From a paper:
A major role in counteracting this equilibration to endomembranes is played by the guanine nucleotide dissociation inhibitor (GDI)-like solubilization factor PDEδ891011. It sequesters KRas from the cytosol by binding the farnesyl moiety, preventing that KRas binds to endomembranes and thereby enhancing its diffusion throughout the cell. Reducing PM localization of Ras through PDEδ inhibition raises alternative opportunities to impede oncogenic Ras signalling.
Herein, we describe the discovery of pyrazolopyridazinones as a novel PDEδ inhibitor chemotype that targets the prenyl-binding pocket of PDEδ with low nanomolar affinity. To identify alternative chemotypes for the inhibition of the PDEδ/Ras interaction with potency similar to Deltarasin (KD=38±16 nM), an in-house library of ∼150,000 compounds, assembled considering structural diversity of the underlying scaffolds, drug-likeness, coverage of different established drug target classes and inspiration by natural products, was subjected to high-throughput screening by means of the previously developed AlphaScreen Technology13. Initial screening and molecular modelling investigations (Schrödinger, Maestro suite) revealed that a C-3 linker between the two hydrogen-bonding groups is important and that shortening of the linker would abrogate H-bond formation between the amide carbonyl and Tyr 149. Therefore, a C-3 linker was kept for further inhibitor development. Since anilides display low metabolic stability, we searched for an alternative to the anilide embodied in hit compound 2a. Based on the fact that pyrazolopyridazinone 2a binds to PDEδ like the Deltarasin-type inhibitors, molecular modelling experiments indicated that 2k will form the same hydrogen bonds as Deltarasin and may additionally form a hydrogen bond with glutamine 78. Herein, we compared the newly developed PDEδ inhibitor Deltazinone 1 based on the pyrazolopyridazinone scaffold to the benzimidazole-based Deltarasin and the genetic knockdown of PDEδ.
Residue numbers in the entry: 2 to 150
The structure:
């Protein structure tokens, strides 16, 4: 399949260089990471301060590079608590220039039901599954276990 291999080429040339999380209201940093969490197969770990749970919302910034051109680069994310899906998030970036590096800012809001759970119950039991697409085409699937510390 040309589709599978195209997806593979995109992945070989892609990485996430860093990300941030800010309080969306003040703009102050909460957490930042430098490991490439695009990487599938490994369960990644993220130890994020629990004050992030006391946020109406979070601003997130991803810096990534891609050798491959992408037509409509986007993300589907689902957040799981003990295998139960709490959130279902979508983000489009769009067209990506080949061999570019890009910063991308997204607003991240949780549902009330999510907000009704404490760090003590969430910590270690949350997994963000991140699906990276170009349009209709799955490039990579990574997962991150979160601790609220
Ligand atoms: C999740 C949540 C609950 Cl359950 C209740 C109340 C608020 C929240 N919101 C958060 O925890 C905000 C953190 C959002 N967040 N945290 C991390 C660690 C993220 C990572 C690693 N990613 C990410 C993963 C793979 C590739 C790109 C970004 N997105 C994240 C991401 O969107």
């Amino acid at each position: 399949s040309a589709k599978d291999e195209r997806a593979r080429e995109i992945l070989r040339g892609f990485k996430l260089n860093w990300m941030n999380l800010r309080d969306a209201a003040t703009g102050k940093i909460l957490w930042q990471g430098t490991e490439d969490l695009s990487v599938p197969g490994v369960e990644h770990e993220a130890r994020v301060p629990k004050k992030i749970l006391k946020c109406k919302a979070v601003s997130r910034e991803l810096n990534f590079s891609s050798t491959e051109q992408m037509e409509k680069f986007r993300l589907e994310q689902k957040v799981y608590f003990k295998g139960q899906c709490l959130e279902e998030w979508f983000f489009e970036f769009g067209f990506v220039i080949p061999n570019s590096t890009n910063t991308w800012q997204s607003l991240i809001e949780a549902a009330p039901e999510s907000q009704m759970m404490p760090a003590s119950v969430l910590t270690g039991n949350v997994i963000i599954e991140t699906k990276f697409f170009d349009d209709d085409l799955l490039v990579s699937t990574s997962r991150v276990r979160l601790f609220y510390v």
